[PDB]
Symmetry: C3
Subunit: 283 residues, 3 copies
Amino acid sequence: VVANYENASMAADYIKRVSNVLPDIGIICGSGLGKLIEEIEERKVIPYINIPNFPKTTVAGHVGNLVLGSVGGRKIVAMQGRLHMYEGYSNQEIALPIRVMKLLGVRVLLITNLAGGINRKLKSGDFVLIKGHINFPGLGLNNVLVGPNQDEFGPRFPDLSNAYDRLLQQLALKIAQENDFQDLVHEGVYAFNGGPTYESPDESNMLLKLGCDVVGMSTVPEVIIACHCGIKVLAVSLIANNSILDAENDVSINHEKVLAVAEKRADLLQMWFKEIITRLPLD
Amino acid sequence: VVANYENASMAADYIKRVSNVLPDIGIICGSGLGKLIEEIEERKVIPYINIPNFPKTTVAGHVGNLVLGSVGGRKIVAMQGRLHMYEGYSNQEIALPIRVMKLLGVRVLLITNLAGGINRKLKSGDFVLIKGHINFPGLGLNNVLVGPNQDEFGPRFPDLSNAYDRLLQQLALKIAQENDFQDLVHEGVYAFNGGPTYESPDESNMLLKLGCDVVGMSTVPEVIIACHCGIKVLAVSLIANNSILDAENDVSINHEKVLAVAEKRADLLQMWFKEIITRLPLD
Amino acid sequence: VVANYENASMAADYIKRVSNVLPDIGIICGSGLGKLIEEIEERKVIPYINIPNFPKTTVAGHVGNLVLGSVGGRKIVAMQGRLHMYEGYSNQEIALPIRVMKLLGVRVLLITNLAGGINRKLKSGDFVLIKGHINFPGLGLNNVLVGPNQDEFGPRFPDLSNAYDRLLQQLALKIAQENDFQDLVHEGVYAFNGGPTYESPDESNMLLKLGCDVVGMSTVPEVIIACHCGIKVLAVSLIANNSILDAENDVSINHEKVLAVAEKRADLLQMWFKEIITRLPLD
Ligand code: HPA
Ligand code: HPA
Ligand code: HPA
């Protein structure tokens, strides 16, 4: 199923009938960072399998829901259960939910993820406001926009110069200052590793020479689809470990340690994004 | 349809019957740089959709023709309407027209494209004679030759050390000196970004560290297929903008500005390649 | 055919019935480096086409056998006829034979390959014990593990920090010292170029800046599948040429010169790995 104007409209038609919510804000949370989706007020949970033209996620399994409701007086739509390209999903399957968000009226997309630190200033438990990215799949002919262009959503050759909104980064940093955890908040360039293997010690060493501050396996496809159709983006990475430090000390990297860091920071991140949603500018 | 010896021969059989032209030179022009195809003498225009085994281009749309005729006393065949890999075409679809050119008797392939400047010495409106390339799709298992090797056309492991002919670069530079626009002609290494998104500011910064002078979204697949079967190549990039300058000044990159640069330089490039064709060495 | 637990078991069932050999060691040899497969004692040769669920190799042609028997008192299984990803094989086709090796009881995998030298200390005819790798296909969303994870074999996010066993590298180096050819044995980082084109002179220059010592077109997919399911790996590259030297002197790179180097070093490499197999630690 192509993520075109007609197929995305069929999905939005179903969502509009099931919930009265017309959201202005979209949210995609990383694994273990989705507790905020539980406190959505007046919420409607729609499984992916019930939405027309939504991608099939049975092979991977686990949760896959679209949740719509209110947070701090704001109408939002949240993706519960993230689609990652290392699972084998095509460009069309990744793009359709974001373009359905666009047809529902989403103008701001807030994204969180887990990732590894490359810049020696980044430690486990730090946050990174993403101000730019280095897209290795895109350079190697695996860009999420490879294929025919859907002209109703955006241009054939998008400009990514301002994909990460400056004013949204300033707002997130100010809220961190107001609550005195600005000592955990950095800015940096995000490198897209397709995955699913963690970067080898020598791959981390290469990313250090290339100017990468953070490396992860997601986010960049969603940001490009959102920037393509004109949706503002705020992207925040939670640093689970510094792979340059781990290479020097021969310390292993595994998913159990990563999720433990997510649990250590889940509540603080939930409070942070709840206030960001509340403080998002109006018209 | 595989771009094998049998399928390419079926296409060449049709072309040979429709036109008496046996071309020695092949031409592929970038968007907005194809006015020379309008001045082909005694020309025959063959739409792609009429040629057996030629790739289907209806989804992308727009012009797609094979034009055969004479330029300056030389017999040429021109591709009007370029096939780009960011559109979703497979390796086989890209390769077949060049291998059909080979079966028609083409020995020299002349290519132009639009691209962005990385080397700080490159300005908008400059020309770059490509003397080498850095193929990011090829390194990441998306090389145009990935798949079974068609032994009738070339070897399994081609050498790209001399893919860009030295004597053809010298000839193009001499013609520029004879007409006093050598101050616009540079040499450089071409980086292949799969596209279709323009390079982010940080991706341009990485390409500067990697030694890339120019970055674009085409040409390298055609050069590899041509070098595979023994066709000499001359490749010229027209610099639409310097993305390193644009990153420092936060200036946007879009296709409208790119085509305006192509229109600014179209006539000069048409005169240039008309003389290159005329001056190409004989046997 | 997916390389899952059920399909690999069907292949192992057939292999177990055809040969009484329960191997503990697996071997994959590069082109021209497989003479050791001829001296397997009490050996059984099983063509790939006869094994259920084994990938189809008729399009590429040439030899494709699984050989099981004894070397120096050790029970081994050898892949005769290597599957390379530049041929067009999918992730599932590459992975299945290694996962069948795992189900047969293989705990150590020994791999050899031909490659080009980047580090200026590497000359033609040298050996390189691979201690790490830089996987460009993996970074660009062409990792061999992209797709659904087969949980019976390994985790979703594997750690590659110790994919190349330290103790196996020490053993191979000691045997080289015992026979006085340690002056040919180096250590280095292996870069994975998808192929099938040899690296351009500028691509070799980039790999020099990125810290790559060796570049080749294989091995890394097999190492990742083996590390995924817990198989120890020893990987040795034979340097056919130094492409940085060849770029400075404009010397061509072709497969005929590469195979001549393999023939020059075949017997020494056969003696080397025969002793490595004999000296592999017991329980
Ligand atoms: O090192 C890592 N840690 C956590 N997440 C990651 N995603 C890519 N690399 C890493
Ligand atoms: O910056 C650019 N400008 C014009 N063409 C391009 N192709 C890739 N990047 C660019
Ligand atoms: O330069 C080379 N020589 C031999 N094998 C190779 N594999 C990749 N590059 C090379």
